[PDB]
Amino acid sequence: YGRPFLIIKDQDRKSRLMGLEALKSHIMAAKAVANTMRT
Amino acid sequence: AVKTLNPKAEVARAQAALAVNISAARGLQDVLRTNLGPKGTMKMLVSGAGDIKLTKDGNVLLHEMQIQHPTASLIAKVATAQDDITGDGTTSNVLIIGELLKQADLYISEGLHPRIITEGFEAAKEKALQFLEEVKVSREMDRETLIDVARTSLRTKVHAELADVLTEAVVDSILAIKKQDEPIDLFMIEIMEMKHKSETDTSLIRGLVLDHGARHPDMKKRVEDAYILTCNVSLEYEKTEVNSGFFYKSAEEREKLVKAERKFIEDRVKKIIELKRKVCGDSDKGFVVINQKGIDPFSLDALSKEGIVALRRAKRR
Amino acid sequence: AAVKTLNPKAEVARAQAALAVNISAARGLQDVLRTNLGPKGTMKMLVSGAGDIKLTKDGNVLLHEMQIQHPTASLIAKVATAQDDITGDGTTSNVLIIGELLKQADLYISEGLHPRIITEGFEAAKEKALQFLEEVKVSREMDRETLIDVARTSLRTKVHAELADVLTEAVVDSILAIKKQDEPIDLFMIEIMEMKHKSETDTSLIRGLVLDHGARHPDMKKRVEDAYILTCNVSLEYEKTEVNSGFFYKSAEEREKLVKAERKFIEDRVKKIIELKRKVCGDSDKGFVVINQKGIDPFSLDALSKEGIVALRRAKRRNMERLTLACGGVALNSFDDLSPDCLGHAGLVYEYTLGEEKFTFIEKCNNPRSVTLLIKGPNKHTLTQIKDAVRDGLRAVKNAIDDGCVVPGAGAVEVAMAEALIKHKPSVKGRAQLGVQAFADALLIIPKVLAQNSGFDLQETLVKIQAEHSESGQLVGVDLNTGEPMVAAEVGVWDNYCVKKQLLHSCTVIATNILLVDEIMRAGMS
Amino acid sequence: PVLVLSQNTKRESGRKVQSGNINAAKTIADIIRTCLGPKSMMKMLLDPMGGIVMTNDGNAILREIQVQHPAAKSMIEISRTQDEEVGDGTTSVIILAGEMLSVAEHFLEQQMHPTVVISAYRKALDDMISTLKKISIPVDISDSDMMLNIINSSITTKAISRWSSLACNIALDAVKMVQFEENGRKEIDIKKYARVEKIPGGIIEDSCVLRGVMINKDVTHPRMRRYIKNPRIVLLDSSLEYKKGESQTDIEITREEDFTRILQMEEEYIQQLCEDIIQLKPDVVITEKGISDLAQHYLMRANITAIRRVRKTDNNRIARACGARIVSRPEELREDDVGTGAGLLEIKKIGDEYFTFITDCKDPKACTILLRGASKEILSEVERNLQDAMQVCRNVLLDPQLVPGGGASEMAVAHALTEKSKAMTGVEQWPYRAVAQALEVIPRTLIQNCGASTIRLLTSLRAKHTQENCETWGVNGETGTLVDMKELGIWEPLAVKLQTYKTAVETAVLLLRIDDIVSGHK
Amino acid sequence: ALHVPKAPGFAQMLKEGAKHFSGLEEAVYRNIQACKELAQTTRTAYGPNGMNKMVINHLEKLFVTNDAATILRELEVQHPAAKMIVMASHMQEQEVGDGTNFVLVFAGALLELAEELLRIGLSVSEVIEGYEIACRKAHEILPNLVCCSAKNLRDIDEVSSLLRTSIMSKQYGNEVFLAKLIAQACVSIFPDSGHFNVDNIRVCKILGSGISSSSVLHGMVFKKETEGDVTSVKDAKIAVYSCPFDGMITETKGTVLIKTAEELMNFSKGEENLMDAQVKAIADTGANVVVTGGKVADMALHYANKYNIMLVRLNSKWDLRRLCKTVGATALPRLTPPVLEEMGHCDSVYLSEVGDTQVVVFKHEKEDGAISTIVLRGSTDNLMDDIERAVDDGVNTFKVLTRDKRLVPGGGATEIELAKQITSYGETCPGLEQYAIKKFAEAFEAIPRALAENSGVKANEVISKLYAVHQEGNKNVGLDIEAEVPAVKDMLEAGILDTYLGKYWAIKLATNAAVTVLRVDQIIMAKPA
Numbered sequence A: 001y002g003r004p005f006l007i008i009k010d011q012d013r014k015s016r017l018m019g020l021e022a023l024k025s026h027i028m029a030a031k032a033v034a035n036t037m038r039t
Numbered sequence B: 001a002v003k004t005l006n007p008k009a010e011v012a013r014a015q016a017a018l019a020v021n022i023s024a025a026r027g028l029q030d031v032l033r034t035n036l037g038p039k040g041t042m043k044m045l046v047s048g049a050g051d052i053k054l055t056k057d058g059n060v061l062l063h064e065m066q067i068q069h070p071t072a073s074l075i076a077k078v079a080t081a082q083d084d085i086t087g088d089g090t091t092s093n094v095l096i097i098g099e100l101l102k103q104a105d106l107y108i109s110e111g112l113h114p115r116i117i118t119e120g121f122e123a124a125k126e127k128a129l130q131f132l133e134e135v136k137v138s139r140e141m142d143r144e145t146l147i148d149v150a151r152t153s154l155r156t157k158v159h160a161e162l163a164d165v166l167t168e169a170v171v172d173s174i175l176a177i178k179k180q181d182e183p184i185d186l187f188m189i190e191i192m193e194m195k196h197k198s199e200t201d202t203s204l205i206r207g208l209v210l211d212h213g214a215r216h217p218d219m220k221k222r223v224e225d226a227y228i229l230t231c232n233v234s235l236e237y238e239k240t241e242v243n244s245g246f247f248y249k250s251a252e253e254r255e256k257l258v259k260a261e262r263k264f265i266e267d268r269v270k271k272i273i274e275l276k277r278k279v280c281g282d283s284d285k286g287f288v289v290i291n292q293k294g295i296d297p298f299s300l301d302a303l304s305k306e307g308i309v310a311l312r313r314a315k316r317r
Numbered sequence C: 001a002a003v004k005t006l007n008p009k010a011e012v013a014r015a016q017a018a019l020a021v022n023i024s025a026a027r028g029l030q031d032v033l034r035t036n037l038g039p040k041g042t043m044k045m046l047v048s049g050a051g052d053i054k055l056t057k058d059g060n061v062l063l064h065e066m067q068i069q070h071p072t073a074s075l076i077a078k079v080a081t082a083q084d085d086i087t088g089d090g091t092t093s094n095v096l097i098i099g100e101l102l103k104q105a106d107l108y109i110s111e112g113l114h115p116r117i118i119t120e121g122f123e124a125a126k127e128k129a130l131q132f133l134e135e136v137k138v139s140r141e142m143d144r145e146t147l148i149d150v151a152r153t154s155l156r157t158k159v160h161a162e163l164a165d166v167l168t169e170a171v172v173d174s175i176l177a178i179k180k181q182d183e184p185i186d187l188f189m190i191e192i193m194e195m196k197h198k199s200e201t202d203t204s205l206i207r208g209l210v211l212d213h214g215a216r217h218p219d220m221k222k223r224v225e226d227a228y229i230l231t232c233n234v235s236l237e238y239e240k241t242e243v244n245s246g247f248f249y250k251s252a253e254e255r256e257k258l259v260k261a262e263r264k265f266i267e268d269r270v271k272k273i274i275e276l277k278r279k280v281c282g283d284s285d286k287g288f289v290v291i292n293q294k295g296i297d298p299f300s301l302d303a304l305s306k307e308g309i310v311a312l313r314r315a316k317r318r319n320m321e322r323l324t325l326a327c328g329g330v331a332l333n334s335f336d337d338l339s340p341d342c343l344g345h346a347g348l349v350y351e352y353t354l355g356e357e358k359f360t361f362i363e364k365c366n367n368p369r370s371v372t373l374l375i376k377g378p379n380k381h382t383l384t385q386i387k388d389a390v391r392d393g394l395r396a397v398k399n400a401i402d403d404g405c406v407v408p409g410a411g412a413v414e415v416a417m418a419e420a421l422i423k424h425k426p427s428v429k430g431r432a433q434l435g436v437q438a439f440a441d442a443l444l445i446i447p448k449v450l451a452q453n454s455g456f457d458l459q460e461t462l463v464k465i466q467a468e469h470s471e472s473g474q475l476v477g478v479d480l481n482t483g484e485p486m487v488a489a490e491v492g493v494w495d496n497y498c499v500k501k502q503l504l505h506s507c508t509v510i511a512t513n514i515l516l517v518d519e520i521m522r523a524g525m526s
Numbered sequence D: 001p002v003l004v005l006s007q008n009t010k011r012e013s014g015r016k017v018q019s020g021n022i023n024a025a026k027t028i029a030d031i032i033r034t035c036l037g038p039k040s041m042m043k044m045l046l047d048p049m050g051g052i053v054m055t056n057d058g059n060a061i062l063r064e065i066q067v068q069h070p071a072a073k074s075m076i077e078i079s080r081t082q083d084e085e086v087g088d089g090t091t092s093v094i095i096l097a098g099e100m101l102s103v104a105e106h107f108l109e110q111q112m113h114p115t116v117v118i119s120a121y122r123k124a125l126d127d128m129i130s131t132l133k134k135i136s137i138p139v140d141i142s143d144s145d146m147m148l149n150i151i152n153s154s155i156t157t158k159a160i161s162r163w164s165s166l167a168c169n170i171a172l173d174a175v176k177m178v179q180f181e182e183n184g185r186k187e188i189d190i191k192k193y194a195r196v197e198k199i200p201g202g203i204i205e206d207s208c209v210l211r212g213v214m215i216n217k218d219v220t221h222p223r224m225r226r227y228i229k230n231p232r233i234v235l236l237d238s239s240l241e242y243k244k245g246e247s248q249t250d251i252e253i254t255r256e257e258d259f260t261r262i263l264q265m266e267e268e269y270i271q272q273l274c275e276d277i278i279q280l281k282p283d284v285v286i287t288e289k290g291i292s293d294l295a296q297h298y299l300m301r302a303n304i305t306a307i308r309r310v311r312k313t314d315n316n317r318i319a320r321a322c323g324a325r326i327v328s329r330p331e332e333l334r335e336d337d338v339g340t341g342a343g344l345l346e347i348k349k350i351g352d353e354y355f356t357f358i359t360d361c362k363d364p365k366a367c368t369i370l371l372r373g374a375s376k377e378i379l380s381e382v383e384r385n386l387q388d389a390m391q392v393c394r395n396v397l398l399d400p401q402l403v404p405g406g407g408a409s410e411m412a413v414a415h416a417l418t419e420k421s422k423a424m425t426g427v428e429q430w431p432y433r434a435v436a437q438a439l440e441v442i443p444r445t446l447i448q449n450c451g452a453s454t455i456r457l458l459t460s461l462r463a464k465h466t467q468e469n470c471e472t473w474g475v476n477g478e479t480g481t482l483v484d485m486k487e488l489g490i491w492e493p494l495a496v497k498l499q500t501y502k503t504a505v506e507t508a509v510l511l512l513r514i515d516d517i518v519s520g521h522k
Numbered sequence E: 001a002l003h004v005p006k007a008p009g010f011a012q013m014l015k016e017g018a019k020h021f022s023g024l025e026e027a028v029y030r031n032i033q034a035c036k037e038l039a040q041t042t043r044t045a046y047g048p049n050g051m052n053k054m055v056i057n058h059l060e061k062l063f064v065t066n067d068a069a070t071i072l073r074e075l076e077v078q079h080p081a082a083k084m085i086v087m088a089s090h091m092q093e094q095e096v097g098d099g100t101n102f103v104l105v106f107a108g109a110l111l112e113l114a115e116e117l118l119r120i121g122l123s124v125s126e127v128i129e130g131y132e133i134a135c136r137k138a139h140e141i142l143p144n145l146v147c148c149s150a151k152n153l154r155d156i157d158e159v160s161s162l163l164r165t166s167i168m169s170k171q172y173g174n175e176v177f178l179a180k181l182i183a184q185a186c187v188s189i190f191p192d193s194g195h196f197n198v199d200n201i202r203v204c205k206i207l208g209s210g211i212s213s214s215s216v217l218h219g220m221v222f223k224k225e226t227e228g229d230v231t232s233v234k235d236a237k238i239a240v241y242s243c244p245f246d247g248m249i250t251e252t253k254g255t256v257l258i259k260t261a262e263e264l265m266n267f268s269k270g271e272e273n274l275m276d277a278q279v280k281a282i283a284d285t286g287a288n289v290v291v292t293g294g295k296v297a298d299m300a301l302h303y304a305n306k307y308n309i310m311l312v313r314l315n316s317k318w319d320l321r322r323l324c325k326t327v328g329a330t331a332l333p334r335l336t337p338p339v340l341e342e343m344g345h346c347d348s349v350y351l352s353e354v355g356d357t358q359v360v361v362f363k364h365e366k367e368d369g370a371i372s373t374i375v376l377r378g379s380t381d382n383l384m385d386d387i388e389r390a391v392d393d394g395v396n397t398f399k400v401l402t403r404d405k406r407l408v409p410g411g412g413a414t415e416i417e418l419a420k421q422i423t424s425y426g427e428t429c430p431g432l433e434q435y436a437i438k439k440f441a442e443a444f445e446a447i448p449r450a451l452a453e454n455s456g457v458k459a460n461e462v463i464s465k466l467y468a469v470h471q472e473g474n475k476n477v478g479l480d481i482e483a484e485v486p487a488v489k490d491m492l493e494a495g496i497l498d499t500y501l502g503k504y505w506a507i508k509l510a511t512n513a514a515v516t517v518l519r520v521d522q523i524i525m526a527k528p529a
């Protein structure tokens, strides 16, 4: 239907990362931390 | 001419003052004239909170009108004084004010001064007083005439069947009066409210209805032949006025002191118990204690074990 | 609510509300306007946005210049302005009668009555009043004295005593100089010229015309004794070719020849005038005046001045007709044929300079069919007041001339008409007869204020007036100096029959239309 | 923030909108309910521009009302339709449409599909038109008294009823004077050839229809005659001065005899035009465009009265009244284009203006009503009533049928199609009889307006109407009493009644067909 | 002329937010419209096919239910006439426990028909007097319509059957189970003296399994945990105290005085010995369970564990008095080991877990007691709330069944029969008021139609069938539910009945509300704050 329904409180500002992109972001942050600790 | 002295001042001069007063009185009369007599129409009034008030009284409606006009307030307090002292005749009061003002302005707008109008009003009031004195009929106020008067008033206020039942109740209520020469006291005929069965079930109870009940669960809920002990003493714990204080040295002393502090009210209640047992404990003759001041649950239990019913925190009247 | 639900930003006033607001507005207008009726009224002073001062006593002037915006106020205002634009008088009485009809209708309606029967009574009363007015007028011969009396009754109402007397003399003298055997009375033939000049009592009547123009050429004569007059509509100004002209030369001498050729046409046009003047009469200082509606070039101005000719340019369109009816000549749109019969005559043409402006007086005509009224005032608002007074007086005199009849004044006719209406009231059947009563009482608003503005009590004066008329059918009205009943015909207070008829018609019609209103609406805003 | 539709789009659907639609219609039926009948009450409207409109008729009431609900717009549209088509019955059609929508609301609420209600409405409309045509009483066109009675019946409910016996006649004359035939075509073109002109200040009974044309012009020159006995009217479309032309010219002058020569040629051309217009020996010349000073000089030389710029409509009316013909090129003006037939030309003065009359024509096919009164609003109202009377007279002229008024036709058709309904078997009978009882609103409104107890009076009307040969029995709203329209003499043209029923049912159908509303988009 | 001024008089002296509505079309019609809106916002929740409705209150709490009184109370209403109808429906709920949706529908129908009559041309007084005459006639003829009066009110099966028809209006599916539990709970409290109370049927809400796991126990269940260390006493003697399980102290402030070291030694030992003596005195009387209305001291708790005394704290006076009623004990203000006549006797006390809710149980095993408790299970709070509302309605039906045991047929039978009788009376009556009488026959049509309106069938068809059958005289036939076609069937055999007193009060209150709202013709609202 035309009406957009709201289910989650304050859902217009919340962010969600799902699937393989979230795992890529996790691995990237971990790589940054490891590179900082490498030297 | 005060706008010269007070720039923020409101002034209505002679013709202006007359016009504004007559207009306000005409407005009040036109609002209030749609209810006079038993053929009038109810008015529903809503305040800020949202409560609903269905009324036809001149004074009630006049107070609950949303008006700010000065002369409107003048006639409003005239009407409420007339209601306070005489009892009714408030809508007709407002109508009469409006009509006097309208006729006076009709005769003044033709190029006349109000002084002669008021002199004529005074003369007419004197003649009207003489005629009213000479037209009244004096009789022996009996059941039938009182039914007639109360029926007229209640038929004005409400519809037929409810007006008649209320008329019977009202007359039977204000007919139990003291000595003929003693003026009537209307505080004794008290009104009690019950959001309850249909409006035609309102009636007159010979005794009293009290909004309070037996506060102890074990007290009996109905006594047939009851003695009544109305009091104003406090069976509640009354502490020493001058900032007292207990001082002891062991738990045994603490127990002795709590017994001692209870002893005073225990004696006071024992007086009531002795009076009841001496008067009659026999043949299920019940005893009721009605107290204006509070009663402590210790004394509630003490009285309840004796088969008594006790009422606490009653009104002064 | 109805409309307010469909249009949230809308105004609705229901039946009782509409009646209340209409009667309130009518009473307000009547209360404002009742203080100027009669010669004993009080002038009002009005200031606009710019800050110009206007003194007035007219109902129309006051009612247009009053700062109000009420709807029924506008309705009665344009009723009054139409009644002024046709008759020329009786506009304050219009709104007074409206106010009193509406007040009496409200009085009889507040008792719980329907307006339709009140309007039926109004119609019956209007019919009977019309018959009474038709059978009460006096039909006489409009001699000088009767016209002076009518003009005095109007102007003394408008202004104070001496100024009114001067203006009545001037107005009667002017109006007797325009009338013919037919009945057109073209009031356009009366110039009304103004001069911030000597005192307000110096206004008078000039047989010829006064023109706000003069001799532009410095060397032109400022006073000619016996003048021929030539009114023209030809343009002595240079006019370029309509079809996209343009010159082409090759040397300075060629340019000079071109300028000569350019002037040649208008030079011939002025040559026609100069040959006409010389052929007609050049001698004995018999002056020649050329008055042109269109412009005159400086070349032609100087050429005419060299020949002792006074010329005026840029005259009004109506001045052509006024001059050809006063000076007796003929208006000319072209110079194809000029003959001595095309010249009017003037017995004195001279020029007076006021401040910076100049005026030309053309007087001493043999028999003018168009005269002018010259108003002199120490300031502008006096001039405007005198202009309004003159307009009202001229309209009153013209209405007297149109039909050979005139009604007694001083409120006598209203008293007699109301008495006749009261006598006739039993004849009309139904309760609507009380409406007739209202109409009768409504008419009493006219005589009452005559006493009210004079300082006397309303009740005593009214009963004294009505007792005299009931005892003897003589038409007696209010005497503003004593309050006793005085016969209007004997004292000379005359009023126009057309004015009274128009009041009795328009007042009743508009009051009937207003009473029938049961809903005042303001919708149409998006 | 993903939006399938726009941010300003609003959708409303289901029973609610249907209810709202009905409500809107009823609201407009609630505004003009008190303006119907001979005892109608005046209604005053404040113009947004600052004017005042005091009327009774429905169309002049709803034209100054601004409404945002679309169903209200459709109601205003049906009002304008009724005004434009037949000119009468506007409040009647609005009231009927509103009350049929209201009575359909009951069936809408009772889970009944709107298509069956629409079909029942269509069947009822066909039957009501048939039974309205059945009870028609023929009229005689030539009978002046009968037409006067018809117009008086149509006009007695409005402001000028007091002067009815006068105004009626006026209308008839106009409708009998614009009547025209040419090439086998009849016109009765009231809009273009029957002008009504209002001059404030005067007396109502001073108004009159003229045997000619009156316009607000004056002679261009003071010496032109203001009184002509038998004018020979000639009408002009073009102008009588020199004009530049179209193509760019840029004449070049080198000789010393070309400037004055050019000016003399301009004057010679104007003189030639004036001589050629004089050649037919006219007496009054009327032109839409300007007159140069030299041109009117030459016209004066031949004793010709000239009138300057005149609107095209006024010139068409003058041509139709005098029998003349408007021409543009005076070189091509014949004798048959010269208007003989005007019997007088008067330059009279009214108030402070000059008005010209071409009155007393031989057989004018265009008239003009000098309508004199007291104020602009009063004359505007009288103008509206006169238009109403003209429309009614034209409807009678083009259609010789009549039908009783006062509510008799409504109850008659209601009873007839109710008797028809009581035979047919099906589920569509209920809306059909709902429409039958729906037409009862007009007698009910008349009784409520005159101030009578509508319940027992209307019941007695229905009972008396059940008896045969009583279809002319209506209610007298002057006193609110059961009378016979035959003795009261009130009949309305069949055209007005059938048009009212048709458009009322049609617009009820239109508003009853809709169940969704989408608002806000570009 | 661009602004209409305020009419002089009252309209010019009004306050800012005050709104004055006067006249029939400006006040009466608006009141009728608002009441019709209020009636139709709930009409869809009428009958055994009424859909539940969800309401978010002003505090953002979800209420899913079809009980008209609840959705009407938890939905903010601002119109005066709608407030009148709300008050009438709530009074009906308080007096009987059913008919609030009936009151809404009847009042809306009466006001709509009154608006129709006022449009026709009747006066306000004429319609009011006709309505009163018709209401009196309906009350006069109602007792003749009753059938199958309640007989026993003690047999389980009969009372379950009687309550099942009052239960089907909510949770149309699981009907017999709820009726069985309600009957079992209600019969065990009927004190064979005629005074049956509705506050002795408590509901305990435990999250977990489905409805079919609900049960009734002849005791109580508290969502609490014992403060001691002993649980599950077998056959306990319970002592109930209204004072904290502590050494009672002076109401007046008391500070102890110690002037010698001996007193400082002996103070704590003496207090401990006194507390031990008190606890031993309470324990030697055979008491196994002690319940207190206040805080429990640590030393008192110790001496409770030492002598094997169960100790259950309570934090509500209502709970304390109800426990006293169900066990047969009475609260006493001091410790004072109770005399033999005030020691509660219960068959067992437990601390049990069913849905991760540790509860204390005072179950009896002899069906005896003045209080019984429904422990109803569910999967959501809202569903258990709806079930609790149904149980309250069933209990109120039983209460109104204890007195005036007469029953009337349901399913639209009684309303249609009453409408037929009242329209016959109206047709057999002269005068101008008869019209109003003929409207009641239409008003009573609103009820069955709504039922059909919620069953997916044609209201007109079922109404026509109802009149067609009732013309014969079988006054006990009404609407059939779930037949896929508008049909009718008997109600005396089907067990679909309603209390005579409930319908009596519903009709009376609906007519009273409609007449009262019709009476007023002028409204002065005053600045909603």
Ligand SMILES: Nc1ncnc2c1ncn2[C@@H]1O[C@H](COP(=O)(O)OP(=O)(O)O)[C@@H](O)[C@H]1O
Binding pocket: B035, B036, B037, B038, B056, B057, B058, B088, B089, B090, B091, B092, B093, B152, B155, B156
């Ligand atoms: N049955 C009746 N018939 C006729 N007149 C009545 C009847 N009952 C009361 N009245 C008159 O109607 C008036 C009602 O006045 P009321 O409304 O009581 O005034 P107020 O409201 O100021 O007390 C009284 O003056 C009384 O004379």
Ligand SMILES: Nc1ncnc2c1ncn2[C@@H]1O[C@H](COP(=O)(O)OP(=O)(O)O)[C@@H](O)[C@H]1O
Binding pocket: C036, C037, C038, C039, C057, C058, C059, C089, C090, C091, C092, C093, C094, C153, C154, C156, C157, C409, C410, C411, C450, C478, C479, C480, C493, C494, C495
């Ligand atoms: N000297 C006078 N004595 C008595 N009455 C007069 C005299 N002069 C005028 N009136 C009356 O007073 C009235 C003045 O009306 P007027 O102010 O002219 O009305 P409007 O201002 O509408 O033209 C006239 O009707 C006239 O009859």
Ligand SMILES: Nc1ncnc2c1ncn2[C@@H]1O[C@H](COP(=O)(O)OP(=O)(O)O)[C@@H](O)[C@H]1O
Binding pocket: D035, D036, D037, D038, D040, D057, D058, D088, D089, D090, D091, D092, D093, D153, D156, D157, D404, D405, D406, D407, D446, D475, D476, D477, D478, D490, D492
């Ligand atoms: N004297 C009368 N008595 C009763 N009804 C009348 C009378 N005159 C006209 N009518 C009815 O009133 C209606 C016309 O009213 P009108 O104000 O013209 O409404 P509309 O503008 O809708 O035509 C007609 O249908 C006619 O039958």
Ligand SMILES: Nc1ncnc2c1ncn2[C@@H]1O[C@H](COP(=O)(O)OP(=O)(O)O)[C@@H](O)[C@H]1O
Binding pocket: E045, E046, E047, E048, E067, E068, E097, E098, E099, E100, E101, E102, E103, E165, E168, E169, E409, E410, E411, E412, E451, E479, E480, E481, E496, E498
């Ligand atoms: N099995 C059934 N078949 C037909 N009708 C029923 C059945 N069960 C209940 N009803 C009817 O449905 C109605 C339910 O109304 P209800 O919602 O209880 O009103 P209220 O909420 O005011 O108490 C009752 O009037 C009853 O007659």
Ligand SMILES: [Mg+2]
Binding pocket: B088, B089, B153, B156, B157
């Ligand atoms: Mg009273």
Ligand SMILES: [Mg+2]
Binding pocket: C089, C090, C154, C157, C392
């Ligand atoms: Mg005057």
Ligand SMILES: [Mg+2]
Binding pocket: D088, D089, D154, D155, D157, D388
């Ligand atoms: Mg019409």
Ligand SMILES: [Mg+2]
Binding pocket: E068, E098, E099, E100, E101, E169
């Ligand atoms: Mg229910």
